[PDB]
Design a binder for this molecule. Sequence first.
Ligand code: 37H
Ligand code: 37H
Lengths: 324, 324
Amino acid sequence: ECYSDVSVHEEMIADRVRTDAYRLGILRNWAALRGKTVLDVGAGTGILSIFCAQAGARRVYAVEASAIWQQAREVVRFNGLEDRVHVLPGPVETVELPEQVDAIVSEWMGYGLLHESMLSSVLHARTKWLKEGGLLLPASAELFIVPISDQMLEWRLGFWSQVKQHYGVDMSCLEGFATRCLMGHSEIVVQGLSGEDVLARPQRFAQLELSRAGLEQELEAGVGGRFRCSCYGSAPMHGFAIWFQVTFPGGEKPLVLSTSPFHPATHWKQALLYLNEPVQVEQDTDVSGEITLLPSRDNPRRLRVLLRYKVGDQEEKTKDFAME
Amino acid sequence: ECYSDVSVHEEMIADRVRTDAYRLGILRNWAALRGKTVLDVGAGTGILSIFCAQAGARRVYAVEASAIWQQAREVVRFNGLEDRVHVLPGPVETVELPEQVDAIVSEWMGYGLLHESMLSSVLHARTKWLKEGGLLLPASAELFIVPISDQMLEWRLGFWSQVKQHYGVDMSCLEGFATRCLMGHSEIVVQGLSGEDVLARPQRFAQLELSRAGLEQELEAGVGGRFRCSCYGSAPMHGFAIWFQVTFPGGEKPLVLSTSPFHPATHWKQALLYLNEPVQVEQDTDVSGEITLLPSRDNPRRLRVLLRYKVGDQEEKTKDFAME
Ligand SMILES: N=C(N)NC[C@@H](CC[C@H](N)C(=O)O)C[C@H]1O[C@@H](n2cnc3c(N)ncnc32)[C@H](O)[C@@H]1O
Ligand SMILES: N=C(N)NC[C@@H](CC[C@H](N)C(=O)O)C[C@H]1O[C@@H](n2cnc3c(N)ncnc32)[C@H](O)[C@@H]1O
């Protein structure tokens, strides 16, 4: 059965924000790519590799570990590009290229940036295959956090109080239940918010420069930091959202692919960290904390988040989460 | 973690078509229920049991095997009904009631009616606890089949031919791939259709009278039968939809809860049986077959479907499906 193969790749190519950012991010580097060689780490259907050929690349190595490489090979053949784009199956960690490359392109980002991401493969490929001074696309990533009020959640929390109006049965007694169940767990929830859900100015809490020596070791130890912000007005705060952006250098201004609730929606949505129950905030309520994103103990590719936070005059609280 | 507990019950109570059909189906039997005793097989949050008390029942035994019984007990207490509705935990197969009952109510239906359904528990309870001549709500179920054209699927099949317009890369070569992946599998797909997707008159292929002696044995051996219909016009046929309705006797006309694509949507949607690839049909194309719904070999609660069919002048074909 290959319906998950098709659905995953459909979703990514259908994500126009993602796919256009890569097309433009790559095309805008034509001066640096024209006549040069590129490695596409995790080429999928081949689309980014073809973008590189459009940008002028002499040779693209499109490396793909899953069965979709069969489709990339077809797409490259079909578009008449087999003498410029070479689709190679298997993991990038063991692929054998005939030369070092001038550039690496990859779409490696996972939910919450780092959940089941391909970052460690991209960093492996950079060390092994990228020439000194070579180009990395994108070049860096940044992580943001902000307090939020989730309207979808608020509706679900209130649902049980609406039963009586429709069916003559009062289930408002189940709000505590719904709250414990929907907020009291320790799972990271992937869900798309809008700008009205954001309760304060978003705060950058980490910056990942992919050329930085030692980045792999930082990721293993945990990336993150402190944050502080001030709320805009009265709202029921449900927790925090985290999201990311990645940046492609220009030839020119950098191009930024953002997953913020204020920007066009992507398939990454945002990663939500719910408090155990809602807390009321007001204009100028201070919200602060420290957050760390790191490998889960049992599966090193699954994302765990350590959070300590303080809302207003409430005491500091710890809540640690895992993607599940 | 109890978020799946809350989400399952939220979905069912939020399904107003389902929940109103049960409320009205039960209330319309007030003459038969007033002063009488009822067993609610799989009481969940308690809502159907409370409907029975609204209808005049003297005593309702609300039997629930999962942890949600704690919530039913609360809801019954909260509404002041603990001296009429008795919430009992554990499986109905081993519950001990102090008396036989005048009626059984249950919402037992699964996807495709019979996938992971509670029917065998309801039939067990009927034999063990229901008085001779007692009332079963609902009393019967019917199964329907029709050839369909799925617009969502058609869009997905065409997706790869639309890439070139947006990104300069021609992926129309991947239609065969998408078709094999989305249609070539043998899984039953649960998806909601609309009336325009139906290509012919729907055909009833089975009728399940829940009082029928021997029904358990029919279910083990397989229920179904032949069908024949005639298409309305030109369309790309993608397969068949199956759905069900259940019927509550009146005091009056029966009340029917339907999951047809022509009727208001429910959380059951319809169960779709895709051909390996589309077939073009025309006005008056004959579509016929034989269909059997039966326990899967490895897990006896999971639904398997055996289908043999003939579209027009095409040769007869077999395609057997499983819910996964
Ligand atoms: N961020 C994601 N979650 N997914 C992005 C796809 C990108 C596919 C394509 N470039 C696109 O942009 O449409 C990642 C691809 O990388 C492949 N992959 C995972 N590890 C790999 C490894 N170690 N070696 C070579 N391949 C690997 C995956 O199979 C997948 O096709
Ligand atoms: N058709 C479905 N898929 N779900 C319907 C729910 C109905 C809940 C409620 N009556 C409502 O209508 O809102 C079924 C309930 O039956 C319970 N159940 C499963 N087997 C059971 C068993 N053998 N003995 C007693 N309980 C059992 C389930 O836990 C669940 O709460």
